[PDB]
Write a protein that binds this ligand. Structure first.
Ligand SMILES: Cc1ccc(-n2nc(C(C)(C)C)cc2NC(=O)Nc2ccc(OCCN3CCOCC3)c3ccccc23)cc1
Length: 336
């Protein structure tokens, strides 16, 4: 057991091994806080996430276990990976706190904004999402503040998950999940990618809605109102009656909206930003789109090892989720 030390940052106590130094706050929300730091065992910059009161409720405890399990499993160049996990506790009996560590990579709109760099950035997002989806995980939260990039334009997907330069989750959300239209699939995340790629091409947020009603209004102005075939798939009656009450909107010509852009970029956006999630392109199909010809390699776009989510079905007490989390802390082995 290393020697720990204590300090207070923004009214939050941090008790961490002495190898982690110069802690500097990055972000904070209801569920936790993140600091940047230097790891003197390696000479590298890291980020440390402290969960707020991880075992104070069932929701907290199960979220804590969910995140540690998933982060321990993620082993992909375009997804966050876990360098370390630790607790100042010396026994289960005083286990009250959880800290997670990753290498510090840091979007904020990589040096130049060329079509080449948009290609590479969106390519890496799709490559990481193919991996995440193959583990039967839906991100649900994709947005520019959940992407990490370095000076070489390499990118990783993460999820702060803190309930935190303003970037609203709703701006990048697919309408079927934002408004509980229907049972939704993994391509909700592809909608978010389309929104991100559009912003990289135009310099502005595609759909900056101020609430869910305005968000839907902005979306339908581009993609048009649902026709009769999709309305029949909107199984929520309240949502269907609302949409049918609206002034109908035509689908816009994307070549005019994104004037000046690579025609292959426009075509890809046309396949991502479609209301019908049965027709929206998947991450693996998008990787094969001609926009990515200079990066796509179907032999270097790997999938995840199988990921056991049977714990999600279990209805457990705080102290049981706590014990399972402690098991996972104790068994962690840092990568090479
Ligand atoms: C309940 C819950 C369940 C699962 C998640 N979840 N889901 C995913 C997938 C789906 C993308 C695999 C990833 C995560 N969790 C995260 O991505 N957690 C983290 C976010 C931001 C961080 O640091 C931000 C600072 N940043 C780090 C990179 O370098 C630049 C700075 C982090 C630093 C250390 C450790 C963990 C961090 C989240 C919550």
């Amino acid at each position: 057991r290393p020697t720990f030390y204590r300090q207070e940052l923004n009214k939050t106590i941090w008790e961490v091994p002495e190898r982690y130094q110069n802690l500097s706050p990055v972000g904070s929300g209801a569920y936790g806080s993140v600091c940047a730091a230097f790891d003197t065992k390696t000479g590298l910059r890291v980020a440390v996430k402290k969960l707020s009161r991880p075992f104070q409720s069932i929701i907290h405890a199960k979220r804590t276990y969910r995140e540690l399990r998933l982060l321990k499993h993620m082993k992909h160049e375009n997804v966050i990976g876990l360098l370390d996990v630790f607790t100042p506790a010396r026994s289960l009996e005083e286990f009250n706190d959880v800290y997670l560590v990753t290498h510090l990579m840091g979007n904020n709109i990589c040096q130049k904004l060329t079509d080449d760099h948009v290609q590479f950035l969106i390519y890496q997002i799709l490559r990481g999402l193919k991996y995440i989806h193959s583990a039967d995980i839906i991100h649900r939260d994709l947005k520019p503040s959940n992407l990490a990039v370095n000076e070489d334009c390499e990118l990783k997907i993460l999820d702060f998950g803190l309930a935190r330069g303003y970037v609203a989750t709703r701006w990048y959300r697919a309408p079927e999940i934002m408004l509980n239209w229907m049972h939704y699939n993994q391509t909700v995340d592809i909608w978010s990618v389309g929104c991100i790629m559009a912003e990289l091409l135009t310099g502005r947020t595609l759909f900056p809605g101020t609430d869910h009603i305005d968000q839907l209004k902005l979306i339908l102005r581009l993609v048009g109102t649902p026709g009769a075939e999709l309305l029949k798939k909107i199984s929520s009656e309240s949502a269907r009656n609302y949409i049918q009450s609206l002034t109908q909107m035509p689908k816009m010509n994307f070549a005019n909206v994104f004037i000046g852009a690579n025609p292959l970029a426009v075509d890809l956006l046309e396949k991502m930003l479609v209301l019908d999630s049965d027709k929206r392109i998947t991450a693996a199909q998008a990787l094969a789109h001609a926009y990515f010809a200079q990066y796509h390699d179907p032999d270097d776009e790997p999938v995840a090892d199988p990921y056991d989510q049977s714990f999600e079905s279990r209805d457990l007490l705080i102290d049981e989720w706590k014990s399972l989390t402690y098991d996972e802390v104790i068994s962690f082995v840092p990568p090479p």
